[PDB]
Amino acid sequence: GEFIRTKPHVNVGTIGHVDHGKTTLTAALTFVTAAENPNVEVKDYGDIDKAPEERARGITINTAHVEYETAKRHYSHVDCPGHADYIKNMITGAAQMDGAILVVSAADGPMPQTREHILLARQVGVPYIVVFMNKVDMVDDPELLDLVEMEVRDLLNQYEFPGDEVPVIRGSALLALEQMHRNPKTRRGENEWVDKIWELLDAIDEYIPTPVRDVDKPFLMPVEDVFTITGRGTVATGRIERGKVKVGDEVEIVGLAPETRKTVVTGVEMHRKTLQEGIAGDNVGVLLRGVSREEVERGQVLAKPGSITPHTKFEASVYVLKKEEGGRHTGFFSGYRPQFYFRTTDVTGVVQLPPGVEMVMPGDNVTFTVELIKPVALEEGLRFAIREGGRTVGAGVVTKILE
């Protein structure tokens, strides 16, 4: 079918520690809203964690995109992995978010990736956060629930989110999900668990503002994934950052390659629905003519031809995490070669310290030069994260492009 715009569109998603309930909540959101809006397509647990490797490991590995809507807005929701081995996919998912739903297990409280996800969500531009305290069906001590809530707000404050003001809904994604299976038509007010899901939706509706979109700037879309649609071609997916794109437009594939590739857009879809035009904010699949899935990849960006120039060298202001925040135990030197994350791009870079600065310690606030091993679309003021050896080691901002 063709996508019909009738209400504002917002991109949300789920982040949080492994096993805290992100995928269960995601499925519940689709079932709950579907009872009220026939246009919503239901997605059960196994329809989201559907890949063979996910069934093999028993965890989410790939980001999943599901759609649902309330009376007020239309939502694209990205469900991310909580396992530490897949932090890379979580970052790519967060880069598509206008707001995030932080899931925390009431039974376990804040764990290492609860903190790491909050820190990373910020560095990729997530402005707002709503908390769903999950698994309360397992905690009878009210004091504990109040304690976890306090801990979570404290954590958010540590990373510059308004911890004291964020809505914190307490519920059970699983019990809400079970109820909807028993009665798919369950409406608001009928069941306790389902009502808590409605509470979350109301908070999303009202707390996360609809972003100001720039549909008049040159088209720019960070690529999050790429695949082949047999008999149709190569599709690049991602959230349009600014501008618009129409079937027939020419776009440039920028970054990660020595040279830039140009091709024509032959299709645009949002959630398998046809669009004549994709605009800033939409989460879409863009069909590209004449390129194979080995010619486009995650981390590159599609852009209006000639509007972007990929760079490799820049100066940056950086905060280096302390051991206590999951950071490094020891300092590093000039020549350190960690991974840098900008939006959906992940690239190796070489740290070059200025003379007189020969070492950087955890907890330090420094400025230094970074030289990337591959060209990528960059801009001054662009935030980024630094990871190395399975941990996030720093967060920074690009202050000046050098080349």
374 among known catalytic residues: no
Among 9, 14, 19, 344, which one carries the catalytic annotation?
19
| Residue 291 in the binding site for ligand GNP (CB under 6 A) | no
Query: Which residue among 62, 76, 89, 134 contacts ligand GNP (CB under 6 A)?
Result: 134
| 88 assigned binding-site residue | no
| Residue 24 in the binding site for ligand GNP (CB under 6 A) | yes
363 sits in the region (left: phi over 0; alpha: psi -120 to 50; else beta) called left
210 among known catalytic residues: no
22 among known catalytic residues: yes
| Residue 81 in the binding site for ligand GNP (CB under 6 A) | yes
Angstrom distances, CA of residue 197 to CA of 132, 194, 231, 254: 9, 5, 40, 41
| Residue 89 in the binding site for ligand GNP (CB under 6 A) | no
| Residue 18 in the binding site for ligand GNP (CB under 6 A) | yes
Question: Tokens 């950071």 appear where?
Answer: 327
In the complex, minimum distance from the CB of residue 68 to Mg ion, in angstroms, rounded to a whole number: 17
CA 25, chain centre distance (Å) = 16
Pick what 313 binds: Mg ion, ligand GNP, none; C-beta below 5 to 8 Å, kind-dependent. Answer: none
| 65 assigned binding-site residue | no
CA distance 176 to 28: 6
Please report, as residue ranges, which positions from 331 to 360 form the binding site for Mg ion (by CB under 5 A).
Answer: none
* Size, binding site for ligand GNP by CB under 6 A: 20
| Residue 114 in the binding site for Mg ion (CB under 5 A) | no
| Residue 19 in the binding site for ligand GNP (CB under 6 A) | yes
CA 86, chain centre distance (Å) = 13
| Residue 59 in the binding site for ligand GNP (CB under 6 A) | yes
Nearer to ligand GNP, 33 or 60 (CB): 60
Query: Which residue among 23, 114, 123, 179 contacts ligand GNP (CB under 6 A)?
Result: 23
Angstrom distances, CA of residue 159 to CA of 123, 165, 299, 361: 10, 14, 26, 20
| 23 assigned binding-site residue | yes
CA distance 49 to 61: 8
| 271 assigned binding-site residue | no
Question: Per the structure block, which two tokens stand in for 28?
Answer: 């519940």
Strand partners for 17: none
Pick what 172 binds: ligand GNP, Mg ion, none; C-beta below 5 to 8 Å, kind-dependent. Answer: ligand GNP
| 12 assigned binding-site residue | no
Please report, as residue ranges, which positions from 147 to 186 form the binding site for ligand GNP (by CB under 6 A).
Answer: 172-174
| Residue 279 in the binding site for ligand GNP (CB under 6 A) | no
Among 44, 72, 83, 260, which one carries the catalytic annotation?
83
- For residue 212, the number of C-alpha atoms closer than 13 Å in the C-beta half-sphere is 1
Q: CA gyration radius for the chain? A: 21
Among 22, 65, 117, 244, which one carries the catalytic annotation?
22
| Residue 110 in the binding site for ligand GNP (CB under 6 A) | no
Q: Where are the beta strands (DSSP E) in 218-333?
A: 220-222, 225-229, 233-239, 244-246, 250-254, 261-270, 273-274, 277-279, 283-288, 301-303, 311-320
| Residue 14 in the binding site for Mg ion (CB under 5 A) | no
Alpha carbon dihedral 264, 214, 162, 129, in 10-degree steps, equals -30
Query: Which residue among 9, 77, 117, 135 contacts ligand GNP (CB under 6 A)?
Result: 135
| 283 assigned binding-site residue | no
Element (H or E) spanning 145, and its range? helix 142-158
| 389 assigned binding-site residue | no
| Residue 60 in the binding site for Mg ion (CB under 5 A) | yes
Question: Per the structure block, which two tokens stand in for 253?
Answer: 């594939």
Nearest-CB residue for ligand GNP: 82
Question: Per the structure block, which two tokens stand in for 310?
Answer: 């990929």
CA distance 254 to 256: 7
23 among known catalytic residues: yes
Contact 280, 220 (CB under 8 A): no
CA distance 296 to 358: 39
| 117 assigned binding-site residue | no
Among 23, 26, 33, 237, which one carries the catalytic annotation?
23
Binding stretches for Mg ion (CB under 5 A): 22-23, 60
Q: Which residues are annotated as a binding site?
A: 16-23, 79-83, 134-137
Binding stretches for ligand GNP (CB under 6 A): 16, 18-24, 59-60, 81-83, 134-135, 137-138, 172-174
Q: Known catalytic residues?
A: 19, 22-23, 83
Q: Which residues are annotated as a binding site for Mg(2+)?
A: 23
